[PDB]
Each structure stands twice: as C-alpha cells, then as structure tokens.
Amino acid sequence: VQLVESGGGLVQPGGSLRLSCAASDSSFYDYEMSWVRQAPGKAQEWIGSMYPSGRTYINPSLKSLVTISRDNSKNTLYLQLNSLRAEDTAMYYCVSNWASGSTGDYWGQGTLVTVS
Amino acid sequence: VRQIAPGQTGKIADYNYKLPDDFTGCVIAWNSNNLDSKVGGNYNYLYRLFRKSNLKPFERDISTEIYQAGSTPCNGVEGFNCYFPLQSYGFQPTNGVG
C-alpha cells in the first residue's frame, strides 16, 4: 500500500467534515495531484486541482465551494464537505491525471461513499 | 473550428495551441454531439482569452497563469490589470448549430 485515504463519514445536513488522500514519495506528487469526486447517478467531477506552477485555479463552478490544502508530513490532503442535500449522492475516489483524458488516469480501489 | 487553421490570430490559434501556416496532414472531427454534450454545461473544458505573444506550432501550456491585461505591475501579486484568463463552458441539449 502506497496511497490511502482518511476521514469522512455520515454528513448531517449543515455539518462539517474532514477528508484526505495520501501518496508515497515526493516525486509521486510531482508534478500534479488533483482532487476528484465521483457519484452514483450524478456525473463524476473533479474536486480541486493544484498546478505545479504555483497558481491554483479551481473550476469556475467548483471554485467557491471546496477548500483545498496539502500536507506532506503524512502526505495527507485536507478535504471538507459542507451542507450536502438529498440530491448530491457522491462516491469519492482519489484518481490522478484527469486532465489527460481516460488514457492517463490511475484506477485502484478507492472507497465507496453514500450521501443520503 | 476555423481558429484551428493557418494564418489566423485569436484566443485559440495563438493562445491555446498554435499551428503553422503550412499544414501537412488531415483535419478529422467525430460528431461530439452524442459524445461530448452533457446536461448543465461542459464547464470542465476551459479556454483563455490572450497570452504574452504568439506561440509556436504544437506547444504545450497546461499552466493557467494569469496574464497582464493592462500594464500595471502585478509584482507577482494578482490584482488590478492582472486578471484570470480562463473561462468555463455551457453546453446544453438546446444549443444550435453555432
């Protein structure tokens, strides 16, 4: 095992939550490590992205809802969920290289998330 | 589509991926109406408006750097006349031919 995820669970509507993903080495984060969600029913979408040039530009539709930060001590990666409603059932995977199409993304096992 | 063509300048022909004036090859385009159209808009795809200057044929720029629309000194600090060039896309099932 070289990458893991930590945090998450039941989401009381209007409550706060913590989520994370990890990596193995500093070269693994090089150069891009972007957050991504998936969802049963709702289309898959990428959560956050940290570009290697120092400038971070989240999606114009997803740049005002998620805060993204990186901690390399555990290789952890803070993620928070706020005010989920009954229409946002999402299942979270930590998959890299989504700005490369479906030819560079890495698929493992991930975790299954249900939001009621 | 005509912005992917030689001899023209615009937000794509010079500021996404330049292509030369002497095309050798082919232009191919699958119908993406039934492949690349989704409800709510395909806002994942992103385009800018300008760059520093003209590019060279087949150059890669994955960086989303903020360009100076005016001439004020950003001094590494985004702000006045230092604006975001990227913008999202809205694709709908009611969109027309254009």
Side-chain angles (χ1 to χ4, degrees):
Chain A
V1 192
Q2 47 183 255
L3 73 164
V4 299
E5 304 93 3
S6 71
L10 296 178
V11 184
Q12 183 65 254
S16 44
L17 211 68
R18 186 66 61 87
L19 275 153
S20 295
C21 190
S24 52
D25 198 8
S26 67
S27 279
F28 267 65
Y29 275 109
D30 208 47
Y31 44 77
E32 169 208 0
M33 186 66 204
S34 310
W35 270 118
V36 58
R37 64 210 91 191
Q38 308 186 7
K42 189 179 62 63
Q44 303 187 350
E45 188 67 28
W46 74 255
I47 300 168
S49 50
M50 311 156 258
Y51 309 118
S53 294
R55 284 164 191 78
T56 287
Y57 180 84
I58 321 293
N59 213 357
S61 300
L62 276 80
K63 72 184 310 180
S64 65
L65 192 147
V66 177
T67 47
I68 297 97
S69 177
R70 187 145 86 187
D71 308 298
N72 276 321
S73 63
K74 197 73 161 45
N75 293 309
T76 190
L77 195 65
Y78 290 166
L79 172 68
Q80 301 151 355
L81 313 184
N82 299 320
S83 193
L84 310 179
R85 57 169 66 180
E87 296 285 323
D88 290 331
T89 314
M91 171 285 317
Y92 290 167
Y93 280 161
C94 184
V95 178
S96 51
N97 279 319
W98 198 234
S100 87
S102 65
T103 191
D105 47 316
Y106 154 68
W107 295 95
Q109 182 46 60
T111 188
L112 187 84
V113 189
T114 72
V115 170
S116 78
Chain B
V1 184
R2 288 187 188 175
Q3 273 160 328
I4 291 176
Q8 289 188 358
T9 63
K11 304 178 176 179
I12 300 169
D14 291 357
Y15 313 125
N16 301 342
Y17 264 81
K18 180 169 279 294
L19 299 180
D21 295 338
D22 298 334
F23 283 172
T24 56
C26 282
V27 169
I28 302 165
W30 311 81
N31 265 338
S32 60
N33 298 338
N34 296 328
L35 281 159
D36 267 325
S37 69
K38 297 167 186 176
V39 190
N42 288 341
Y43 63 91
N44 198 51
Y45 288 84
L46 298 169
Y47 279 54
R48 298 176 223 163
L49 320 179
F50 287 103
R51 288 196 196 177
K52 301 176 185 172
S53 62
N54 300 354
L55 285 167
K56 287 187 177 185
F58 303 89
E59 285 184 351
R60 300 177 179 176
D61 272 331
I62 318 179
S63 63
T64 62
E65 284 178 345
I66 277 173
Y67 302 102
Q68 301 183 334
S71 60
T72 65
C74 318
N75 271 339
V77 173
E78 319 162 355
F80 295 92
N81 292 160
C82 312
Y83 289 111
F84 280 100
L86 264 190
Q87 287 172 337
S88 49
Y89 271 89
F91 280 118
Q92 302 171 337
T94 61
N95 282 118
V97 176

Short mmCIF file of all heavy atoms in Angstrom, two decimals, chain A residues 31 43 45-46 51 53 55-63 98-99, chain B residues 38 43-46 62-66 76 78 84-88:
data_model
loop_
_atom_site.label_atom_id
_atom_site.label_comp_id
_atom_site.label_asym_id
_atom_site.label_seq_id
_atom_site.Cartn_x
_atom_site.Cartn_y
_atom_site.Cartn_z
N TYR A 31 4.10 15.98 -10.89
CA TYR A 31 4.02 17.42 -10.65
C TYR A 31 2.62 17.86 -10.23
O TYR A 31 2.45 18.90 -9.60
CB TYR A 31 4.46 18.18 -11.90
CG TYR A 31 3.88 17.63 -13.19
CD1 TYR A 31 2.56 17.87 -13.55
CD2 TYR A 31 4.67 16.88 -14.05
CE1 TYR A 31 2.04 17.37 -14.72
CE2 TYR A 31 4.15 16.37 -15.23
CZ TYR A 31 2.83 16.62 -15.56
OH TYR A 31 2.31 16.13 -16.73
N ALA A 43 -23.01 12.99 -12.34
CA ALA A 43 -21.81 12.79 -13.13
C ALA A 43 -20.56 12.95 -12.28
O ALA A 43 -20.54 13.68 -11.28
CB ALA A 43 -21.77 13.77 -14.30
N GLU A 45 -17.04 14.37 -11.24
CA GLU A 45 -16.45 15.69 -11.38
C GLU A 45 -15.21 15.77 -10.51
O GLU A 45 -15.11 15.10 -9.48
CB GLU A 45 -17.45 16.79 -11.00
CG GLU A 45 -16.99 18.20 -11.30
CD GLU A 45 -16.87 18.47 -12.78
OE1 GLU A 45 -17.60 17.83 -13.57
OE2 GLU A 45 -16.05 19.33 -13.18
N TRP A 46 -14.26 16.60 -10.93
CA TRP A 46 -13.01 16.78 -10.21
C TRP A 46 -13.16 17.88 -9.16
O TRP A 46 -13.70 18.95 -9.45
CB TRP A 46 -11.87 17.05 -11.19
CG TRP A 46 -11.84 18.42 -11.82
CD1 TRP A 46 -12.18 18.71 -13.10
CD2 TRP A 46 -11.33 19.64 -11.26
NE1 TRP A 46 -12.00 20.04 -13.35
CE2 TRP A 46 -11.47 20.64 -12.24
CE3 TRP A 46 -10.81 19.99 -10.01
CZ2 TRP A 46 -11.09 21.95 -12.02
CZ3 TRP A 46 -10.44 21.31 -9.80
CH2 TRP A 46 -10.58 22.27 -10.80
N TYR A 51 -1.89 23.08 -9.42
CA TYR A 51 -0.99 23.03 -10.55
C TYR A 51 0.45 23.27 -10.10
O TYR A 51 0.69 23.96 -9.11
CB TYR A 51 -1.40 24.08 -11.58
CG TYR A 51 -2.87 23.99 -11.94
CD1 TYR A 51 -3.73 25.05 -11.69
CD2 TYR A 51 -3.40 22.84 -12.50
CE1 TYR A 51 -5.07 24.97 -12.00
CE2 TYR A 51 -4.74 22.75 -12.81
CZ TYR A 51 -5.57 23.82 -12.56
OH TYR A 51 -6.91 23.73 -12.88
N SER A 53 2.79 25.09 -11.20
CA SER A 53 3.36 26.40 -11.46
C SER A 53 3.15 27.38 -10.31
O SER A 53 3.59 28.53 -10.41
CB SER A 53 2.75 26.99 -12.74
OG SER A 53 3.14 26.23 -13.87
N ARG A 55 0.24 28.55 -9.21
CA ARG A 55 -1.08 29.15 -9.29
C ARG A 55 -2.14 28.06 -9.29
O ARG A 55 -2.08 27.11 -10.07
CB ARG A 55 -1.21 30.01 -10.54
CG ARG A 55 -0.50 31.35 -10.43
CD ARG A 55 -0.32 31.99 -11.80
NE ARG A 55 0.59 33.14 -11.76
CZ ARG A 55 1.91 33.05 -11.72
NH1 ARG A 55 2.52 31.88 -11.72
NH2 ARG A 55 2.63 34.16 -11.68
N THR A 56 -3.12 28.21 -8.40
CA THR A 56 -4.21 27.24 -8.25
C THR A 56 -5.49 27.87 -8.77
O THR A 56 -5.90 28.93 -8.29
CB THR A 56 -4.38 26.82 -6.79
OG1 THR A 56 -3.30 25.95 -6.42
CG2 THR A 56 -5.69 26.09 -6.61
N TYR A 57 -6.11 27.22 -9.76
CA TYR A 57 -7.35 27.70 -10.36
C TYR A 57 -8.34 26.55 -10.37
O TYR A 57 -8.26 25.65 -11.22
CB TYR A 57 -7.11 28.24 -11.77
CG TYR A 57 -8.37 28.74 -12.44
CD1 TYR A 57 -8.83 30.03 -12.21
CD2 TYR A 57 -9.09 27.94 -13.31
CE1 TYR A 57 -9.97 30.50 -12.81
CE2 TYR A 57 -10.23 28.40 -13.93
CZ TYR A 57 -10.67 29.68 -13.67
OH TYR A 57 -11.81 30.16 -14.28
N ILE A 58 -9.28 26.57 -9.43
CA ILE A 58 -10.32 25.56 -9.39
C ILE A 58 -11.36 25.87 -10.46
O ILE A 58 -11.39 26.95 -11.05
CB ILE A 58 -10.95 25.47 -7.99
CG1 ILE A 58 -9.87 25.62 -6.92
CG2 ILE A 58 -11.63 24.13 -7.78
CD1 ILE A 58 -8.89 24.48 -6.88
N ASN A 59 -12.22 24.89 -10.73
CA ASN A 59 -13.22 25.01 -11.77
C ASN A 59 -14.15 26.18 -11.43
O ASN A 59 -14.54 26.33 -10.26
CB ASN A 59 -14.02 23.71 -11.86
CG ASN A 59 -14.47 23.40 -13.27
OD1 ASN A 59 -14.26 24.17 -14.20
ND2 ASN A 59 -15.08 22.23 -13.44
N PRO A 60 -14.51 27.03 -12.40
CA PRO A 60 -15.37 28.18 -12.10
C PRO A 60 -16.68 27.80 -11.41
O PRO A 60 -17.25 28.61 -10.67
CB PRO A 60 -15.64 28.79 -13.48
CG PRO A 60 -14.43 28.45 -14.26
CD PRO A 60 -13.92 27.13 -13.75
N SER A 61 -17.15 26.58 -11.66
CA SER A 61 -18.35 26.08 -10.99
C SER A 61 -18.06 25.42 -9.66
O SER A 61 -18.97 25.28 -8.83
CB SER A 61 -19.08 25.09 -11.90
OG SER A 61 -19.46 25.70 -13.12
N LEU A 62 -16.81 25.00 -9.42
CA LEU A 62 -16.43 24.33 -8.19
C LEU A 62 -15.32 25.06 -7.43
O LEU A 62 -14.69 24.46 -6.56
CB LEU A 62 -15.99 22.89 -8.49
CG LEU A 62 -17.07 21.81 -8.61
CD1 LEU A 62 -17.74 21.85 -9.97
CD2 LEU A 62 -16.48 20.44 -8.36
N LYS A 63 -15.07 26.33 -7.75
CA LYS A 63 -14.02 27.09 -7.06
C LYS A 63 -14.52 27.83 -5.83
O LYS A 63 -13.69 28.33 -5.06
CB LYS A 63 -13.37 28.10 -8.02
CG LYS A 63 -14.25 29.28 -8.39
CD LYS A 63 -13.57 30.18 -9.41
CE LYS A 63 -12.15 30.53 -8.99
NZ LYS A 63 -11.46 31.40 -9.98
N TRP A 98 -6.69 13.41 -14.46
CA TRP A 98 -7.98 13.54 -15.13
C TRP A 98 -7.97 14.59 -16.22
O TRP A 98 -8.85 14.56 -17.09
CB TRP A 98 -9.09 13.85 -14.12
CG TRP A 98 -10.46 13.56 -14.66
CD1 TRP A 98 -11.52 14.42 -14.71
CD2 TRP A 98 -10.91 12.34 -15.28
NE1 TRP A 98 -12.60 13.81 -15.29
CE2 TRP A 98 -12.25 12.54 -15.66
CE3 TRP A 98 -10.30 11.11 -15.54
CZ2 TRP A 98 -13.00 11.54 -16.28
CZ3 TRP A 98 -11.05 10.12 -16.16
CH2 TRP A 98 -12.38 10.34 -16.52
N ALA A 99 -7.01 15.51 -16.21
CA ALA A 99 -6.81 16.45 -17.31
C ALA A 99 -6.00 15.84 -18.45
O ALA A 99 -5.45 16.59 -19.27
CB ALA A 99 -6.14 17.73 -16.80
N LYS B 38 -23.28 17.35 -22.38
CA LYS B 38 -23.83 16.91 -21.11
C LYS B 38 -24.76 17.98 -20.56
O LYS B 38 -24.65 19.17 -20.89
CB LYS B 38 -22.71 16.60 -20.09
CG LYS B 38 -21.81 15.45 -20.52
CD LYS B 38 -20.54 15.37 -19.68
CE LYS B 38 -19.61 14.29 -20.23
NZ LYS B 38 -18.32 14.24 -19.51
N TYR B 43 -18.55 22.53 -18.53
CA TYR B 43 -17.70 23.54 -17.91
C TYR B 43 -16.34 23.00 -17.50
O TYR B 43 -15.48 23.79 -17.08
CB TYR B 43 -18.43 24.17 -16.72
CG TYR B 43 -18.75 23.22 -15.59
CD1 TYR B 43 -17.88 23.03 -14.54
CD2 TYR B 43 -19.95 22.52 -15.58
CE1 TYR B 43 -18.18 22.16 -13.50
CE2 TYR B 43 -20.27 21.65 -14.55
CZ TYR B 43 -19.38 21.47 -13.51
OH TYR B 43 -19.68 20.61 -12.48
N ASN B 44 -16.11 21.69 -17.59
CA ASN B 44 -14.77 21.16 -17.35
C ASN B 44 -13.77 21.68 -18.37
O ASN B 44 -12.65 22.06 -18.00
CB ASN B 44 -14.80 19.63 -17.38
CG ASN B 44 -13.58 19.03 -16.72
OD1 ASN B 44 -13.24 19.38 -15.60
ND2 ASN B 44 -12.92 18.11 -17.42
N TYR B 45 -14.15 21.71 -19.64
CA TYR B 45 -13.28 22.28 -20.66
C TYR B 45 -13.16 23.79 -20.46
O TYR B 45 -14.15 24.48 -20.19
CB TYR B 45 -13.81 21.96 -22.05
CG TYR B 45 -13.64 20.51 -22.44
CD1 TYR B 45 -14.58 19.55 -22.05
CD2 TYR B 45 -12.56 20.09 -23.19
CE1 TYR B 45 -14.43 18.22 -22.40
CE2 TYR B 45 -12.40 18.76 -23.55
CZ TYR B 45 -13.34 17.84 -23.15
OH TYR B 45 -13.19 16.51 -23.50
N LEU B 46 -11.94 24.29 -20.59
CA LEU B 46 -11.63 25.67 -20.25
C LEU B 46 -10.78 26.30 -21.34
O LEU B 46 -9.88 25.65 -21.89
CB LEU B 46 -10.91 25.74 -18.90
CG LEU B 46 -11.69 25.24 -17.68
CD1 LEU B 46 -10.79 25.11 -16.46
CD2 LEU B 46 -12.87 26.15 -17.39
N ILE B 62 -0.07 23.75 -20.09
CA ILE B 62 -1.06 23.31 -19.12
C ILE B 62 -1.17 24.29 -17.96
O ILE B 62 -2.14 24.22 -17.19
CB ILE B 62 -0.71 21.90 -18.62
CG1 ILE B 62 -0.25 21.03 -19.80
CG2 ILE B 62 -1.90 21.24 -17.94
CD1 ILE B 62 0.13 19.63 -19.42
N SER B 63 -0.22 25.20 -17.82
CA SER B 63 -0.31 26.22 -16.78
C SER B 63 -1.46 27.17 -17.07
O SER B 63 -1.72 27.53 -18.22
CB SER B 63 1.00 26.99 -16.67
OG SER B 63 1.28 27.70 -17.86
N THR B 64 -2.15 27.59 -16.01
CA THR B 64 -3.28 28.51 -16.10
C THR B 64 -2.90 29.90 -15.62
O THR B 64 -3.68 30.58 -14.94
CB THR B 64 -4.47 27.97 -15.30
OG1 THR B 64 -4.10 27.88 -13.91
CG2 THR B 64 -4.84 26.58 -15.79
N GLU B 65 -1.69 30.35 -15.96
CA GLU B 65 -1.14 31.57 -15.39
C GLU B 65 -1.97 32.80 -15.75
O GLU B 65 -2.57 32.87 -16.83
CB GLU B 65 0.31 31.77 -15.85
CG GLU B 65 1.32 30.87 -15.16
CD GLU B 65 2.73 31.07 -15.68
OE1 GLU B 65 2.89 31.70 -16.75
OE2 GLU B 65 3.68 30.61 -15.01
N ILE B 66 -1.99 33.75 -14.83
CA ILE B 66 -2.73 35.00 -15.01
C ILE B 66 -1.88 35.96 -15.82
O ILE B 66 -0.73 36.26 -15.46
CB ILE B 66 -3.12 35.60 -13.65
CG1 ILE B 66 -4.40 34.95 -13.13
CG2 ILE B 66 -3.26 37.11 -13.74
CD1 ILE B 66 -4.76 35.37 -11.72
N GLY B 76 4.25 39.93 -9.10
CA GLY B 76 3.93 38.63 -8.57
C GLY B 76 2.63 38.56 -7.81
O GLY B 76 2.28 37.48 -7.32
N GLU B 78 -1.42 39.09 -7.96
CA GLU B 78 -2.59 39.26 -8.81
C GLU B 78 -3.44 40.42 -8.31
O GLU B 78 -3.52 40.68 -7.10
CB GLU B 78 -3.43 37.99 -8.83
CG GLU B 78 -2.62 36.71 -8.93
CD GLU B 78 -3.43 35.49 -8.51
OE1 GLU B 78 -4.58 35.67 -8.07
OE2 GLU B 78 -2.91 34.36 -8.63
N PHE B 84 -7.83 36.80 -14.40
CA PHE B 84 -7.88 35.39 -14.79
C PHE B 84 -8.28 35.27 -16.25
O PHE B 84 -9.30 35.85 -16.66
CB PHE B 84 -8.88 34.63 -13.92
CG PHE B 84 -8.34 34.24 -12.57
CD1 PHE B 84 -8.65 34.98 -11.44
CD2 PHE B 84 -7.55 33.11 -12.43
CE1 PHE B 84 -8.17 34.61 -10.20
CE2 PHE B 84 -7.07 32.74 -11.19
CZ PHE B 84 -7.38 33.49 -10.08
N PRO B 85 -7.53 34.54 -17.07
CA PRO B 85 -7.91 34.38 -18.48
C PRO B 85 -8.85 33.21 -18.74
O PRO B 85 -9.58 33.21 -19.73
CB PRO B 85 -6.56 34.19 -19.19
CG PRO B 85 -5.56 33.85 -18.10
CD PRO B 85 -6.26 33.86 -16.77
N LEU B 86 -8.84 32.21 -17.85
CA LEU B 86 -9.64 31.01 -18.07
C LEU B 86 -11.12 31.28 -17.86
O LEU B 86 -11.51 32.10 -17.02
CB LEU B 86 -9.19 29.89 -17.13
CG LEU B 86 -8.21 28.88 -17.70
CD1 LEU B 86 -8.06 27.72 -16.73
CD2 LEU B 86 -8.63 28.40 -19.08
N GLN B 87 -11.95 30.59 -18.63
CA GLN B 87 -13.40 30.68 -18.52
C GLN B 87 -14.00 29.31 -18.84
O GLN B 87 -13.42 28.50 -19.56
CB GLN B 87 -13.96 31.75 -19.46
CG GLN B 87 -13.69 33.18 -18.99
CD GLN B 87 -14.08 34.22 -20.03
OE1 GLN B 87 -14.15 33.93 -21.22
NE2 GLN B 87 -14.31 35.45 -19.57
N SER B 88 -15.20 29.07 -18.30
CA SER B 88 -15.84 27.77 -18.40
C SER B 88 -16.70 27.70 -19.66
O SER B 88 -16.72 28.61 -20.48
CB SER B 88 -16.64 27.48 -17.13
OG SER B 88 -17.48 28.57 -16.79
#
